[PDB]
Copies of this chain bind each other. A is one copy, B any other.
Amino acid sequence: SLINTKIKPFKNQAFKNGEFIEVTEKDTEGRWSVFFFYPADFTFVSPTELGDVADHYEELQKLGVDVYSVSTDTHFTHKAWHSSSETIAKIKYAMIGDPTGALTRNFDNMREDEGLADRATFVVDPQGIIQAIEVTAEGIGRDASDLLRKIKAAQYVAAHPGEVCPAKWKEGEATLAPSLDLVGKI
């Protein structure tokens, strides 16, 4: 898998809050990032997923997490989608266009027979290492609240070497401190 591997350099145009910009791996350095891939603009499941992420974007930014949604459509298409759909209109993060498919292939996420990216999400830490991955079938929407829980645990372990987050962990709950004595006792 790509788990625990460094993301690859990339260069893409994106639509973000009314303007076109260029995004590269340099923009991710030193930051937590979420690469949110979806099949295509103007579809059915994708907007509700992108809307869901938008509903948690202020919390993600406060956590120092940037979000980049990615599809194989052009940034021009994203711009138009943003103007015509009310749920896409609330998006204030960068919507990356990946028409050559290089960003999508970098994440091993292209459905070759369709020219579209699969429904996948990648959490990337400040050193660019992928810490959590989620991929679902075409007809199955993702859940932003699950993404957030995983991000908080990833941030928690980064700040607490020697500790690990048990299943279901949430801020305030007990963690584990790996030791030779704890081996077999849990």
Contacts and interface: CB of A to CB of B under 8 A. Distances in A.
Interface stretch (A27-35, A59-67, A145-153): A145-153
B168 A144 contact: yes
Contact of A76 (B108, B134, B145, B183): B183
A118 B41 contact: no
A68 B26 CA distance: 40
A63 B21 CA distance: 37
Copies in the complex: 10
Nearest to A110: B1
Interface residues on A, range: 35 or more
Interface in A16-40: 18-20, 40
B140 A131 contact: yes
Given A41-B74, A77-B42, A4 B184 contact: no
Given A40-B77, A131-B136, 15 more contacts: A3-B120, A20-B180, A40-B99, A41-B80, A43-B76, A44-B176, A80-B81, A85-B184, A100-B115, A101-B115, A132-B136, A133-B135, A139-B163, A144-B168, A146-B149
Interface of A: 1, 3-4, 18-20, 40-45, 47-49, 51-52, 72-74, 76-77, 79-81, 83-85, 87, 98-102, 108-109, 111-116, 118-120, 131-146, 149-150, 153-154, 157, 163-169, 176, 178, 180, 182-186
